[PDB]
Amino acid sequence: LTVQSERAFQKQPHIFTNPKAKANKKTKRWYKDVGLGFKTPKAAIEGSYIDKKCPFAGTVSIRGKILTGTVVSTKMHRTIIIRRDYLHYVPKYNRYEKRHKNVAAHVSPAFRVEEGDVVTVGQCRPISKTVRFNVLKVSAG
Amino acid sequence: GFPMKQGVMHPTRVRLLLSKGHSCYRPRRTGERKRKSVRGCIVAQDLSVLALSIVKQGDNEIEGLTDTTVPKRLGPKRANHIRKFFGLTKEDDVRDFVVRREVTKGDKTYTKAPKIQRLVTPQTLQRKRALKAKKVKNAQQQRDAAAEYAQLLAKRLHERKEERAEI
Amino acid sequence: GISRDSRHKRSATGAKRAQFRKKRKFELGRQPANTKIGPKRIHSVRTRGGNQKFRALRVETGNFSWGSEGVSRKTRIAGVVYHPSNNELVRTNTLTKSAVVQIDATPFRQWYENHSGRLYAVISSRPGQSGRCDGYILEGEELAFYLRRLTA
Amino acid sequence: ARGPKKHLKRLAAPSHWMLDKLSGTYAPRPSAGPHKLRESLPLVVFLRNRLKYALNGREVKAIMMQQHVQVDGKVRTDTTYPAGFMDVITLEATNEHFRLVYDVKGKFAVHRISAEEAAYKLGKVKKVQLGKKGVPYVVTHDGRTIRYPDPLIRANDTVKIDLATGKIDDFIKFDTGRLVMVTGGRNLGRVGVIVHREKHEGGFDLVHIKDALENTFVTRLSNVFVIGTEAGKPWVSLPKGKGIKLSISEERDRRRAQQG
RNA sequence: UAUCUGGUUGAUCCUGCCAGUAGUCAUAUGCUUGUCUCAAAGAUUAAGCCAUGCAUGUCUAAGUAUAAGCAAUUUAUACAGUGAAACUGCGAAUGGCUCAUUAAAUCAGUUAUCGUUUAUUUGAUAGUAUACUUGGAUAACCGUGGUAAUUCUAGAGCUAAUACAUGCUUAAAAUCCCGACUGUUUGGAAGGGAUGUAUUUAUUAGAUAAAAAUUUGAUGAUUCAUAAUAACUUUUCGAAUCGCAUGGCCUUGUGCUGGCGAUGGUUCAUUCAAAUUUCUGCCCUAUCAACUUUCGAUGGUAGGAUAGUGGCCUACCAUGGUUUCAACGGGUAACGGGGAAUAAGGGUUCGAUUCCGGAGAGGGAGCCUGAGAAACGGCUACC
RNA sequence: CCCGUCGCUACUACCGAUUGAAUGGCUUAGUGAGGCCUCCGGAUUGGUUUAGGGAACCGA
RNA sequence: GAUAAGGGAAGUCGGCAAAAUAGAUCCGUAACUUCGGGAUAAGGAUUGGCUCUAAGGAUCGG
């Protein structure tokens, strides 16, 4: 697994490592905290992956709704699907029925998720046809 | 009756999409375009009328065409147009050179003359002075409001310097 | 007219979406410029809100910046030599973003003196948006990756 | 639909204008201006429906075309000018000065003030940020932009604008114990002091406000307008009733005693 | 008013339906019809077809007036009052109508734009390194017309602008680059260029855990605001405009200065908006169980296009995405909602229709202008 | 009391040769109006404008 | 043994004789069925030359 696996060089935009510099030849890395009390995983501060859609190493911003669900599919590259279960109230019968909605979310390489885990996703700008949420925290299941 | 359009190299009629600025068309609203049939620019036997301009006068006078003349309806109106028309200098006074056409209303006749455009007048210079004086006054009001803010910031910063020194 | 709306597409579950409304102007699209190399020719396009965009149909020179020295000079470009999207653009010399081009080295050489005659560059401007082919000079690992890809 | 709307149906007008159902099909659509559409009062409504100086729109147009009406020290001839919260309207021909302050019942009270008080107004600071040439500026609730503010000024504070030069006379910091009027919600028009501010990052901050009758209510921070440095010391004259909310039974008792 | 009664038997008690009964913002129809107030009305069938007329135009002291228009001689021989026609500006994208399509589509409540465009209104904001003020067209107008016919227009002769195309006028410093000479312990320098604002790149500030051996804004969050450096640009605009008053200083000049206003202008903010967008919620049907992915279906990388996000499109690469918790398909005598009728409670039925949102102008499709239209009382083409 | 063939009359639906017929929606393939972008093109029409007969060369 | 305007089986017992189709790649493919077939069903698109690009392997060297 290598970062430079594409036909184009993968790098963070406008983050310049001057070749004519001192001996501390460490590639300058940019990162941010997303706010809302979410901790930045150290795989982002210290990693080398490039992901423009990562909340911590990319240019996306977290704003809007924060959702939680159970991961049911990790078969896409950098994209997972979580399943959200809820109870719908039926007023006529004074009872409930089980319902579910599937939300597609982007997962950054800073996280490792398998099928069955419970993750917390925050809303972001549309980053795909079906993806509007982006993983902010992972809880093993 | 279809008119001839310049550049259509045909002796017959064609239909074009005419727009603003095209001859043979007058747009009813802004940005409007109409498809109109127009006659080509090549003369043939299918013309009902041909328009001609005399370039060089011939041998014999034409009965109603080359002997008489009609004066131009309007004289120059812009100041510089009057100056170009008959030797004025930029220092000459155009005011007593406008041609006035006099109208006869029954018994008393008076003259009517155009209002000269682009004429420099004390009101025009007054407006130039007002604009430049206002620009300077604005610039001073901004640079002394900025200077006053610099005083306010310097006062606050010095006060915070002593606040840190106390703490 | 070319549009960007997702109405023409089908849903994620695969359902063929029906005809909701006619196409709207506030989602239109236009043709790619396909910037070439030739006498500088730009066309301005009337966009939404009164803004104006400049199709770079063909260009000759654009400003390029040496990141190590912080110097930007206007210099000639030879042609595009590497494009991650399509190799047809490399073959036909189409100038788009993220495309590796070769630039004339005379201004950078003269600045270096005052302080193979063609230097590699990556266009960072969008000629089909602004009409300028502005880019930077490859250095370091980016340079190494692109040179490995070019030589093979 | 294809562009901005220019009409307002009478039934769709804001309820605090107190327009009648059967007077017509349409209501005055307020123009663009310093105040938002829903939180404003057009001058045609103020001059005809509230004061009843003009009997109809021809008369309000004749009045405003004779240059009588001034809002915040400038002559307005737009019959649909969107007058709003805290604006001062002066009619020196009749020698009358009004201030638009909400009463506790949720409507704009007809609150007359002296010319000396009509010489200024208050504005809530919405944002502080840097303008061109690195010059900071403040945006108040009525869309005003004041350059070179006091470096201590932050968001949610209230400044007192001289209203003749457009400069800042002085300001009030947002803090516990400040006098506040509510400018939104069902508590519109109420006045009280801040007791405790409860923050919610990523959401809407909530402010706990205590009435003069020791009634406590909660409202969003966006509906809070600081009007005084402490309890009983407002920077503007309050409307009749002093912003104290009475129950419906208490109001019924008061009206019965007042009318006999 | 939380109600029942007649009908199967020779007679009985039941199940059970038929029938009776009352309302309907529920339509039609018959007979009949004196008064006051209020008031629906070609939705249902045919989003079937249309004669005719009207429904969108518009001028203030303040854009352009030689109407050969009217009026009077008057503070006026450049015009000056009033005022057709035209050019210019703005509006014509509002309103009004209808409900064909449309079943996660529209819509409702709740969210987001740190993902964008925004005429206008309202605040701020621009001294930037021939001037007593630049050009040449054109309309109306005059007079030659062609066609049976249209809100068709062509030749010829004029003339104007806040129309079109161009252009100076100015503070004081200060800073940066190149740099002849010079000082010669690394300084001083003549002379050349550059400074406002927009565009496009690249690179730097943009800080903020508490003692020992000088500045630095906001946010929950940013590569935000903003500043600086090196350049770039078929070089954006920093008023060649218009009305009323006519004042002040004398070194007796058409001298120098200046008051209230019209309109316009760059950027930021505001407002009127627009466009996408999070969550949850739609009627009948399984005699609809698998659907989507050639020729985008799900995702990754790069680009193009857009006002902007986004398979919106392209190239390459993976095989993904939805579904018995009903996907997909079909039907709807289906616009959604606020609401309406009846109702002890729970419910059942209706909602074309006075308000909000959406869509359409015979059916499609494509566009110009404009801030705003895929507009139809705008155009182009087909049926 | 009652069941059913068969016969007569009337009505409703079903099957049925006719590769039956008609109407509407979606679509493969072929042809393809029109607009838009691009590429040249350059009727005529102004002069960067220069010329003792005037030869040019710039823009739209 | 060839070709033929317009029509296209009206010729003849009868489409006899001739014509038309035809390789390959890709798409699409009905009734019926003994479930194996029918099937190359039917019905469409492409195909030259040149200049390139990409993929598919072997043997040595730790």
Short mmCIF file of C-alpha atoms in Angstrom, two decimals, chain C residues 15 20 42 45 54 76 92 104 120 123 132:
data_model
loop_
_atom_site.label_atom_id
_atom_site.label_comp_id
_atom_site.label_asym_id
_atom_site.label_seq_id
_atom_site.Cartn_x
_atom_site.Cartn_y
_atom_site.Cartn_z
CA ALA C 15 -35.23 3.29 -10.38
CA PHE C 20 -40.27 16.10 -13.52
CA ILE C 42 -9.43 34.06 -26.02
CA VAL C 45 -18.48 34.11 -22.33
CA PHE C 54 -12.43 33.55 -20.78
CA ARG C 76 7.23 30.22 -23.38
CA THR C 92 -2.60 16.36 -29.25
CA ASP C 104 11.45 27.99 -21.91
CA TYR C 120 9.09 20.95 -16.72
CA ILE C 123 -0.30 23.95 -15.01
CA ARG C 132 -4.14 31.78 -18.46
#
